C-alpha cells in the first residue's frame, strides 16, 4: 500500500534491433580506408550472472559488412583503366616457349596508341583459361568475359589485402560477445560479456575451406542450422592449425603497353624452364585432422558411416580451392585430399597438389562484372594456416552419409567468424513503483 509511480534513468535493459555499425582502421596502410576512420584501443568487461540468447544465422551485421566489402572494392577499383579496346580479334599460334600447351597464349592484335592515327601491331602473353575460342578457324580467339561485361585492370600499387578491421558500435548500442567456449551457433549463453568494438576481423577470400582465421577454444566445433536436415552449408571450425605451403616457381616478365595517360600491363616472357605451380600439405596433420573431424561429426548422426568425395560440376570456384596470394589467384586441385571413408562401428610425408592460375576473375559473388589481375614478376611462395572447412552433404541412403566440400557463397565465410557478436539497443527509461509521494 501507499505505492506511487517513479521513474529511473540509466536503466540496464536492452532490446535487439538493426543498426548501422561503425568501423576502424590501421596506422600503416596501402594509401576511404587508408587514413580513416579512427584506430582506438578496446576494452572488455564480463557481464556476471547474465544469460542471453544468440543466433549466428539471423544476425544482421554479416550482410552489412558484406555490403561494406563490396563497396570498398568498388571504390578501390573505380579510378582504374577500362580494358575495352583490347576486345579486338586475337590471332594466336602459341609456339614460343619450350612447352606451349600449359599456357597457350604467347596472340597478336591491333591497338590504338598515343596518336589515334591507325592501330599498331602488338603481342602479349595470356592463359588459355582467360582465352575463349571463336567460331570457324581455331586460331581466332577472344577474351572470356567481353561478350558479357567490361573488364578493368587493377592498379598494382593500391592493392587491397586482409587488413584487420574492428567494428565499432554507435552510441547507445552495445555489442555482446558470448565468451563461452562450447557455443553451438545458437541458444543461450551464460558467459555474456561486452566490448566497445570487435577484434581484428580480416577480409579473407577463399573457397572450399577458410584460412588466416581465428581458432576454436576446446576441440573442433561444428555449426549448422537446425530448422531442417536439408542444409545449405555446414561450418567446421578447427581447434588446431594446419599449415599449407603454396608456390608458383617460375619468374615472369612484366611488359607495358600504352593506350592517354593509362599504361596497360601484360606478361612478356617466362624466365627459364616451365614448372607447374603446386601446394604442399603435411600428410600426418591432414589425415589426423580428418579422423578427428569425422569421429566428432558422428555425434550428430547416430549409426551411419562417413565418406568423402570432392565436389562435382560447376565453375572452377567450387571444383577447386581458389584463393589469392600476393597479386596472383590460385585454383588448387583437391581431389586427393578428400578421398577417405570411415565405418560407424608429427610431420612425416607431404601431399603435393597441382594448381592453375588465371588473370581475369569475376567478382566473388556476382557475374556481369570482371577484373583483370596484373602480372606478377618473379617466383611466389606463400605459407598459410587453415582454420576450418565449409562442407555440404549429399542425400545418400541407409547406413551411409556423405559429405563433400563446397561454399561458393562468400558470405558464409564471414559468417564463420562473426558468430560471437550481437548488437543490442539500450532502453534506459524503466519505470518503477516506490513508497514515496511527490512534494505538493
Amino acid at each position: 500500500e501507499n505505492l506511487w509511480v517513479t521513474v529511473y534513468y540509466g536503466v540496464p535493459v536492452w532490446k535487439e534491433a538493426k543498426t548501422t555499425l561503425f568501423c576502424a582502421s590501421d596506422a600503416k596502410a596501402y594509401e576511404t580506408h587508408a587514413c580513416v576512420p579512427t584506430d582506438p584501443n578496446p576494452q572488455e568487461m564480463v557481464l556476471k550472472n547474465v544469460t542471453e540468447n544468440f543466433n549466428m544465422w539471423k544476425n544482421d551485421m554479416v550482410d552489412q559488412m558484406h555490403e561494406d566489402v563490396i563497396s570498398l572494392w568498388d571504390q578501390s577499383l573505380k579510378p582504374c583503366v577500362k580494358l575495352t579496346p583490347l576486345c579486338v580479334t586475337l590471332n594466336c599460334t602459341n609456339a614460343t616457349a619450350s612447352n606451349s600447351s600449359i599456357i597457350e597464349g604467347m596472340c597478336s592484335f591491333n591497338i590504338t596508341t598515343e596518336l589515334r592515327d591507325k592501330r599498331e601491331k602488338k603481342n602479349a602473353l595470356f592463359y588459355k583459361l582467360d582465352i575463349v575460342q571463336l567460331d570457324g578457324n581455331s586460331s581466332q580467339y577472344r577474351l572470356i568475359n567481353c561478350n558479357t561485361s567490361v573488364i578493368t585492370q587493377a592498379c598494382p600499387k593500391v592493392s587491397f589485402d586482409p587488413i584487420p578491421i574492428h567494428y565499432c558500435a554507435p552510441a547507445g548500442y552495445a555489442i555482446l560477445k558470448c565468451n563461452n567456449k562450447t557455443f553451438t551457433g545458437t541458444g543461450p549463453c551464460n558467459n555474456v560479456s561486452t566490448v566497445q568494438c570487435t577484434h581484428g576481423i580480416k577480409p579473407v577470400v577463399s573457397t572450399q575451406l577458410l584460412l588466416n582465421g581465428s581458432l576454436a577454444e576446446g576441440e573442433i566445433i561444428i555449426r549448422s542450422e537446425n530448422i531442417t536436415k536439408n542444409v545449405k552449408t555446414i561450418i567446421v571450425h578447427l581447434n588446431e592449425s594446419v599449415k599449407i605451403e603454396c608456390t608458383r616457381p617460375n619468374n615472369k616478365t612484366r611488359t607495358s603497353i600504352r593506350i592517354p595517360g593509362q599504361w596497360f600491363y601484360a606478361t612478356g616472357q617466362v624466365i627459364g624452364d616451365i614448372r607447374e605451380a603446386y601446394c604442399n600439405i603435411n600428410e600426418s596433420k591432414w589425415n589426423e585432422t580428418l579422423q578427428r573431424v569425422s569421429k566428432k561429426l558422428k555425434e550428430y548422426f547416430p549409426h551411419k558411416n562417413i565418406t568423402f568425395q570432392p565436389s562435382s560440376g560447376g565453375d572452377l570456384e567450387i571444383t577447386t580451392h581458389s584463393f589469392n596470394c600476393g597479386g596472383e589467384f590460385f585454383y588448387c586441385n583437391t581431389s586427393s585430399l578428400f578421398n577417405r571413408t570411415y565405418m560407424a562401428n608429427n610431420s612425416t610425408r607431404t601431399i603435393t597438389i597441382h594448381c592453375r592460375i588465371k588473370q581475369i576473375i569475376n567478382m566473388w559473388q556476382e557475374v556481369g562484372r570482371a577484373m583483370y589481375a596484373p602480372p606478377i614478376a618473379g617466383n611466389i611462395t606463400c605459407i598459410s594456416n587453415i582454420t576450418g572447412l565449409l562442407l555440404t552433404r549429399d542425400y545418400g541412403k541407409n547406413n551411409t552419409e556423405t559429405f563433400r566440400p563446397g561454399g561458393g557463397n562468400m558470405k558464409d565465410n564471414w559468417r564463420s567468424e562473426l558468430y560471437k557478436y550481437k548488437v543490442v539497443k539500450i532502453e534506459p527509461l524503466g519505470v518503477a513503483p516506490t513508497r514515496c509521494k511527490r512534494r505538493v
Partner: nanobody, 113 residues
Framework: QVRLAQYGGGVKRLGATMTLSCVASGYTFNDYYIHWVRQAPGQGFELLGYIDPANGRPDYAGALRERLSFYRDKSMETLYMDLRSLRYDDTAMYYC???????????????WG
C-alpha cells in the same frame, strides 16, 4: 510476375540423349535454387535433383547419378537438363520448380513451370 518458361520435349527416340531448357524471367536469378521434378502416369511425383544457379553446384538422386546432368548459363539466365540413354520408363511430365530457402536451409516450393 515470375515465369518459368520451358522448351524442348514431345517425342524422343529410344536410347538417345535429350535436352530440356528453362528460362526464368522476373526475379533475382542468383537467389533461389531450382529443383527438377517429374511425374510418370499412374505414379506419384519424384525428385531428380537440384541446382544452385549462382555457382553451378548440382545434386542428384541416388539411383540416377550416372544418367543426369544439369548446368546453366547466367547471362541468358537459362537452365539445361541433359539426360543420357533414354529408356521406356522415362515417359513423364517434367517440371522445373523454384525453391524458397533461408540463409542456411531450404524450404517449400512456390512456383511451378
Amino acid at each position: 510476375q515470375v515465369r518459368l518458361a520451358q522448351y524442348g520435349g514431345g517425342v524422343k527416340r529410344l536410347g538417345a540423349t535429350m535436352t530440356l531448357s528453362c528460362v526464368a524471367s522476373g526475379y533475382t536469378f542468383n537467389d533461389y535454387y531450382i529443383h527438377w521434378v517429374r511425374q510418370a502416369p499412374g505414379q506419384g511425383f519424384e525428385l531428380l535433383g537440384y541446382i544452385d544457379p549462382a555457382n553451378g553446384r548440382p545434386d542428384y538422386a541416388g539411383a540416377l547419378r550416372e544418367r543426369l546432368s544439369f548446368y546453366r548459363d547466367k547471362s541468358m539466365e537459362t537452365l539445361y537438363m541433359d539426360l543420357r540413354s533414354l529408356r521406356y520408363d522415362d515417359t513423364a511430365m517434367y517440371y522445373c520448380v523454384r525453391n524458397v530457402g533461408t540463409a542456411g536451409s531450404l524450404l517449400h516450393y512456390d512456383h511451378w513451370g
